[PDB]
C-alpha cells in the first residue's frame, strides 16, 4: 500500500497523487480517509506490466 | 521487408486495442454500473488566493 502519482479524468488529463493498495489479486485506489475504495484494475491474473524505457 | 514489418506491427496493434477496448467498455460498464453521481460537479481551484484560479 502506498502512493503513486496517476492522471485525472479531466479533459486535460491532468497528473494527481493518490494512495493505492494491492491486496487479494486486486488494485485499489482510496479516495477519502475513511471513506469505501474504488477498483483501478477488476484483476492482477489477467494485467501485462510496462517498464517504458522509451517513454 | 516493410511489408512485413508494419504488417507484424499492425497485429500486434490490433491485439493490444482489442485489449485496451475490452479493457475500457468493462470500466465504461462499471461506472454506470454504481459510482457515477447524481450532484453537481465543483470548481477546482488552483494557484492559491493570489491567482485563484476557478
Given amino acids: 500500500e502506498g502512493h503513486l502519482f496517476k492522471r485525472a479524468s479531466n479533459a486535460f488529463k491532468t497528473w494527481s497523487r493518490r494512495w493505492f493498495t494491492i491486496q487479494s489479486n486486486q488494485l485499489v485506489y482510496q479516495k477519502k480517509y475513511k471513506d469505501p475504495v474504488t477498483v483501478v484494475v477488476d484483476d492482477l491474473r489477467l494485467c501485462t506490466v510496462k517498464l517504458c524505457p522509451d517513454s | ?54
Avoid at chain 2, 506491427?9 to 462499471?30: G, I, P, T, Y
Wanted: aromatic content about 2%; proline content about 6%.
Fill in chain 2, 1 to 54: 521487408q516493410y511489408r512485413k514489418e508494419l504488417g507484424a506491427q499492425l497485429h500486434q496493434l490490433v491485439l493490444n486495442s482489442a485489449r485496451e477496448k475490452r479493457d475500457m467498455e468493462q470500466r465504461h460498464v462499471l461506472l454506470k454500473q454504481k459510482e457515477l453521481g447524481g450532484e453537481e460537479p465543483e470548481p477546482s481551484l488552483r494557484e492559491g488566493p493570489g491567482g485563484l484560479v476557478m
